[model samples]
Target: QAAQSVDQLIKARGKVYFGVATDQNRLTTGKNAAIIQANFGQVTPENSMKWDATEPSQGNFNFAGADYLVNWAQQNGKLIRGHTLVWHSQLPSWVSSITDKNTLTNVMKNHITTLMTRYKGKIRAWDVVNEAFNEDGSLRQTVFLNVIGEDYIPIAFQTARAADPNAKLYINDYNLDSASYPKTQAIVNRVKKWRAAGVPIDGIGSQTHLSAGQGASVLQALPLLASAGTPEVAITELDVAGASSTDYVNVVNACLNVSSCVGITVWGVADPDSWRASTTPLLFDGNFNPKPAYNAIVQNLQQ
Candidate 1:
């Protein structure tokens, strides 16, 4: 099963993809786009589709950056993932300042509807809501929850489904794959309830941003995350600092073995491009060389 591409290796064995988070800036830069076009079968726009970038001012939207990335993905034979529609971070100040429920509800709906409609069929999935919980499984006191109560979760899902009927709607967060993170069960319980109530949620995104040697934990978290009543789970945003090459292999092997784990997206392509670049938390080194971590995962996949 020796293969040159990670995505090709996965599809040969199962229905899953290997993806990387990229943006207009990264792709337009030298070599990065070439590496991604060669290696990944999918791409997630890192910041272009976030709350801040998509709609910085109320009733006003911008799409140049996002459009560029999507167009590039379309041309590159890569599946497209919309990074987020709603998140507390990177949110415009105007959104957080609203005190009334009705005002915020319309605001949320308008943005989701507008963005989702524009990108329909172009995107395979969207993180409709991101990082809604604390590490202890308690809900974070963001404006969405503060104004709309827990019902905001289903509201966001329903809005996304109404706007883009074809796109997979996901709740993405860090630590969902830690196995020890209480946030996992917190999400699971709500997803179970929401689905029973006929909410249109589709996936759970375990954003496995790790330090070192926790790939087996990511493996263990798959079934637990799938049990959240979502039909699929994904290693949505993955990167590790001080990680063993074996850890990368284990992470890939975990997704391969888990039936409900649909895909994996490393947060970035190269160390220097990473948000946590000091940790070198990615597969490619600073020089765009395939590090042992990259080699290990491909090696595992090729087997």
Candidate 2:
């Protein structure tokens, strides 16, 4: 029950949110939730409750695992970040096959309303939309686009608001670190526009998959999101691979430098178990050991 690396730093810094990229079964039913409860402040139901896992068919609600995690989080007095009310990936075949724009739009909005309403006040933040924009700042070629066109983002947020008025809604994505300023800036600009237009967007999820030294560009971009008509910023999906001490310092410093950067959720704890190993550009090794980069980060964050 010792602070799992970043727990102390998170608590000391007054940033209460922690990210655990876990499958829901392990987290909800067994020792993992207890393990997490003893360490971090808030928790999101990582991956097992994603789109495919939750609603694989139309009107089929599978909140078994998700509900368990949410209940556990609530019971333990942790904030819940309901990830991905709407996303293009891991979708059900029925969703993807909805060929008509009108039908798809209605379906998308209904999904958001139903899910958000079910969880309602229990969740503090919801990734209302995930990775909707590509790295080039264009719309991702999702079925939502193929049917409902560009209005999918707006409708989703509105429906979510109608369902859960108390929850903070956000747009989430990866590679929002300092090095990825151009794309991040573009997304922030879009978020600003939405906020300006009276959309109820509460924050931006800068999935800060950080690298070492040169990643400061993303940290620099934090101000943009901070000022993007929202008081909260989530360093949502953070991971750094193939780096050493200096890199870790820069990345953590970037998070520390921002007031609204309230959450720093590493994508995975160790390199060996990391999704980055599939891509060969992240921290952790094959055995879940804190590699040099991981050790460096924990130490740097401690200070």
Q: Specify the highest-lDDT model's number.
A: 1
* Tens digit per residue, CA lDDT, model 1, 1-303: 112778887788785689999998998886788888888889999899988998989888999999999999999899988989889999999999998999998999999999999988889999999999997888898999999778888899999998989999998898776666689878888789889999988998888887688777877777788877687888888898875786777788778877878889999888888999999888888788788877777777775
TM-score per model over all chains: 0.97, 0.86
The 10 consecutive residues of candidate 1 with the worst lDDT sum are: 1-10
* lDDT of every predicted structure (CA atoms): 0.86, 0.71
Best by TM-score: 1
Distance from true position, residue 231, model 2, in Å? Answer: 1.9
Candidate 2 stretches greater than 4 Å from native: 1-5, 28-35, 179-181, 211-214, 243-245, 278-303
Candidate 2 C-alpha lDDT tens digits along 136-158: 87778899876887778788888
- As a whole number from 0 to 100, the lDDT of residue 7 in candidate 1 is 81
